[PDB]
Amino acid sequence: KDYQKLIVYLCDFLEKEVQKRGFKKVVYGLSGGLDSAVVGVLCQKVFKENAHALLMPSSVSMPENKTDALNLCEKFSIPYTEYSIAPYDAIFSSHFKDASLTRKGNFCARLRMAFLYDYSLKSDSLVIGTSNKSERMLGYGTLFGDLACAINPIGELFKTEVYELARRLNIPKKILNKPPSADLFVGQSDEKDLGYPYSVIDPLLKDIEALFQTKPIDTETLAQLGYDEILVKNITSRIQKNAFKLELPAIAKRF
Amino acid sequence: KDYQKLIVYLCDFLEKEVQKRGFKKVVYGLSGGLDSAVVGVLCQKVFKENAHALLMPSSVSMPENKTDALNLCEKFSIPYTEYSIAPYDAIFSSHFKDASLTRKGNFCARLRMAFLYDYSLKSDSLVIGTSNKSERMLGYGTLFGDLACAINPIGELFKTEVYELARRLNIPKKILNKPPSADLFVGQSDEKDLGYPYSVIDPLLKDIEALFQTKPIDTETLAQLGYDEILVKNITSRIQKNAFKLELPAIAKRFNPELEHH
Numbered sequence A: 001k002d003y004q005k006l007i008v009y010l011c012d013f014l015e016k017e018v019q020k021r022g023f024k025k026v027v028y029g030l031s032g033g034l035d036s037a038v039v040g041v042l043c044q045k046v047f048k049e050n051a052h053a054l055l056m057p058s059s060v061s062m063p064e065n066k067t068d069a070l071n072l073c074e075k076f077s078i079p080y081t082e083y084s085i086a087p088y089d090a091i092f093s094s095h096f097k098d099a100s101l102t103r104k105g106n107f108c109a110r111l112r113m114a115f116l117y118d119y120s121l122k123s124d125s126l127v128i129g130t131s132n133k134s135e136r137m138l139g140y141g142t143l144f145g146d147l148a149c150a151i152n153p154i155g156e157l158f159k160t161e162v163y164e165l166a167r168r169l170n171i172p173k174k175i176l177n178k179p180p181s182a183d184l185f186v187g188q189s190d191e192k193d194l195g196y197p198y199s200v201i202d203p204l205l206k207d208i209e210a211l212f213q214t215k216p217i218d219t220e221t222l223a224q225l226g227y228d229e230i231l232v233k234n235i236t237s238r239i240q241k242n243a244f245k246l247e248l249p250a251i252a253k254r255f
Numbered sequence B: 001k002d003y004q005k006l007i008v009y010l011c012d013f014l015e016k017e018v019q020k021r022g023f024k025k026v027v028y029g030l031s032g033g034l035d036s037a038v039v040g041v042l043c044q045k046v047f048k049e050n051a052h053a054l055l056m057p058s059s060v061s062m063p064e065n066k067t068d069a070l071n072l073c074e075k076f077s078i079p080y081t082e083y084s085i086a087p088y089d090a091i092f093s094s095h096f097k098d099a100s101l102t103r104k105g106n107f108c109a110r111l112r113m114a115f116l117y118d119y120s121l122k123s124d125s126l127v128i129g130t131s132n133k134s135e136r137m138l139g140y141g142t143l144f145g146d147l148a149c150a151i152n153p154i155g156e157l158f159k160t161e162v163y164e165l166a167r168r169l170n171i172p173k174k175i176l177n178k179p180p181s182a183d184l185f186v187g188q189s190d191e192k193d194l195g196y197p198y199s200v201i202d203p204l205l206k207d208i209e210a211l212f213q214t215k216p217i218d219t220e221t222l223a224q225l226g227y228d229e230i231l232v233k234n235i236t237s238r239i240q241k242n243a244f245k246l247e248l249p250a251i252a253k254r255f256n257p258e259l260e261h262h
C-alpha cells in the first residue's frame, strides 16, 4: 500500500531525466483517459506550470473525453492548449475513404506525435509519453505515434497498476471508471480490440514479463500455470508480432 | 572489387532482414536525392517489383527533384506512386504562419513517415530507411520523421561512402552531383545548415568513431590532430546534443523499494 513511495519514485524520475537533458519544461497529450491523466498529474507535481497538457481531438474523438480532460486541468491547475487535428484527418478521409479504422487511427496518432514534438521545439520542452507496460508488451499502440516520446514514467507499469496509482493520485472517478479506449474511432475500446479485460490480461502479462523478458515465450509453461489455452495463444501471438515496436530499426553493420 | 562485395553485402542484408520478419515487399520515400536513390536501386535488385517508391512532394519541394526521382524509377523499372503532402502542410502554414523553417520542415518529414507507414500497412510492406551514417551521428534528420523505418541498409555508411557506392550503382549524374539538401524549404542545403560539406565533415567523423566509442569526445585530442577549432566545436556539439535520436525513450524501471532490513 506504499503507493506514496511509488509516487515519490516516479516524480524523482521525471525531475532527474528532464534535468539531465538540460530541460525544465514538458508537454504531453491529454486525452481524457486514465494513462495521460496519471502522467499529467505526476508532471504537475514536479514542474507545476512548466508542465503543459495538449488536447488534440480528431473528427471522431468522443466529446466527453475532451471535457473530462479540461476538467482535469482545472482541478489540478494544469496549463493546457486545445488544438484540433480534424482538419488534417478530414483530408486523409477524403483521400482514403475505404481506409481501415486502424489506418485512420494510426494516422491520427502520428499527427498527435507531430504536434507534440512541434509544441516541444517551439516552447523548449520535452515530450512525456504515456504508454503503459500492458500496451507496450502487446504492441497495442502506433509505432512513431503514441509510442513516441523522450521520457515515459509509466512504461513499466501494467494497466492495472496505473489504475491503482491513479486512485492514490486522486484522479477523478469519471476517468477512473472510464473503460480504456484508444478513441481512434467511435465505439472503440481496449476490451473489444484485445478481446479480454486488463483484469485477465495483466496477470498473464506479468508472468510472461517475469519468465520470458529476454527469452522466447513457452506456451506450455504458461499452460501449466493454469492459463486458458486460447488466451495464451492470443496474447503470445500479439506480443511476438509486435516485439519490433520496442526495438530500434535494423541497421546494416559497417562493412 | 570491394564495392561489389559491399553491394552483395547490402543486398543480402535487405533480403534476410525482410524475410526473417515474414515480409516480401518494401516501400521507401524517393526524394530525388542521392541517399534514397541508392536505397531504391538496392531494393530493386533484391525485391524487383515488390520494392515500391513513394514520391511525396510538399508545397515547397523543388519540382526538379520529383522529375529526377521519376527518371530514376524509369531507368531502373521501379514501381512508384506520387502522393502530395501539400494539402496538409498548407493547413500547418495557415495555423502557424510564423513557425520556424525547422518546425515546418519537421512537420513535413513526419507527414512522410506517416504516409510511408500507412502505405506499408495497406500493402503488407516494410519501410526501408535512407539515413546515412553522417546524418545519424550528427542528428541531422527529424526524429520519428525521416529517421523512422524498419530497416536501413546505409545507416553505417558515411555520406562520402554513399556517393562512392552510388557511382558503382550507376545512379544518374543529375543525382550524383546534386548538392545534399533536406529540401524542406526553398534554398536549403546540408552545407549551409551544417556549415561544412561532407568532404570536410566525414574525415572528422571517422576519427571520432575510431578514437571515441568507450569514452566521450576529447576536443583537445582532435585539436592535436590538426582539425580546426570551430569545426570540432560544431561537430562535437551536434553529436552529443543529438545522440538521443539514436536511442529508445527513457522508461522508468520497475520500482524496487529498499526494505527496512536491507
Ligand SMILES: Nc1ncnc2c1ncn2[C@@H]1O[C@H](COP(=O)(O)OP(=O)(O)OC[C@H]2OC([n+]3cccc(C(=O)O)c3)[C@H](O)[C@@H]2O)[C@@H](O)[C@H]1O
Pocket: A102, A105, A106, A109, A135, A139, A140, A141, A142, A143, A145, A146, A181, A182, A184, A190, A193, A244, B021, B117, B120, B121, B122, B125, B126, B127, B150, B151
Ligand atoms: N517485423 C517487423 N519489423 C519492423 N517493422 C515492422 C514489422 N512488422 C511490421 N512492421 C511495421 O509496423 C507497421 C505496423 O505497426 P503500427 O503502424 O503501429 O500498426 P498496427 O500495429 O498494425 O496498428 C496499431 C494498433 O495498436 C493501435 N493503437 C494505436 C494508438 C493508440 C492505441 C491505444 O491503446 O492508445 C492503440 C491500433 O488502434 C491498432 O489496433 C507496419 O505497417 C510496418 O510498416
Ligand SMILES: Nc1ncnc2c1ncn2[C@@H]1O[C@H](COP(=O)(O)OP(=O)(O)OC[C@H]2O[C@@H]([n+]3cccc(C(=O)O)c3)[C@H](O)[C@@H]2O)[C@@H](O)[C@H]1O
Pocket: A021, A117, A120, A121, A122, A125, A126, A127, A149, A150, A151, B102, B105, B106, B109, B135, B139, B140, B141, B142, B143, B145, B146, B181, B182, B184, B190, B193, B241, B244
Ligand atoms: N536530450 C533529449 N532527449 C530526448 N529528446 C530530446 C532531447 N533533446 C531534444 N529532444 C526532443 O527532440 C526534439 C528535437 O529533435 P527534432 O524534432 O528531430 O528536431 P531538430 O533536431 O531540432 O530539427 C531537425 C534537424 O535535422 C534536420 N533535418 C530534418 C529532416 C531531414 C533532414 C535531411 O537531411 O533529410 C535534416 C534539420 O534541418 C534540423 O537541422 C525536440 O523538440 C524534443 O522534443
Ligand SMILES: Nc1ncnc2c1ncn2[C@@H]1O[C@H](COP(=O)(O)OP(=O)(O)OP(=O)(O)O)[C@@H](O)[C@H]1O
Pocket: A028, A029, A030, A031, A032, A033, A034, A035, A036, A037, A054, A055, A056, A057, A058, A061, A112, A130, A131, A146, A178, A179, A180, A181, A182, A183
Ligand atoms: N484527443 C487526444 N488529445 C490529446 N492526446 C491524445 C488524444 N488521443 C490520444 N492522445 C495521446 O495518446 C495516448 C493514447 O491514449 P491511450 O488510450 O493509450 O491512453 P489514455 O487515453 O490516456 O488512457 P486509457 O488507456 O484508459 O484510455 C494518450 O495517453 C495521449 O497522450
Ligand SMILES: Nc1ncnc2c1ncn2[C@@H]1O[C@H](COP(=O)(O)OP(=O)(O)OP(=O)(O)O)[C@@H](O)[C@H]1O
Pocket: B028, B029, B030, B031, B032, B033, B034, B035, B036, B037, B054, B055, B056, B057, B058, B061, B112, B130, B131, B135, B146, B178, B179, B180, B181, B182, B183
Ligand atoms: N519529396 C519527397 N518525396 C519522397 N520522399 C522524400 C521527400 N523528401 C524527403 N523524402 C525522404 O526523406 C529522406 C530525406 O533525406 P535526405 O534529403 O537527407 O536524403 P536524399 O534526398 O535521399 O539525399 P540527399 O541527402 O543528397 O539530399 C529521403 O531519403 C526520403 O526517403
Ligand SMILES: [Mg+2]
Pocket: A031, A033, A034, A180, A181, A182, A183
Ligand atoms: Mg484513451
Ligand SMILES: [Mg+2]
Pocket: B031, B032, B033, B034, B180, B181, B182, B183
Ligand atoms: Mg533531398
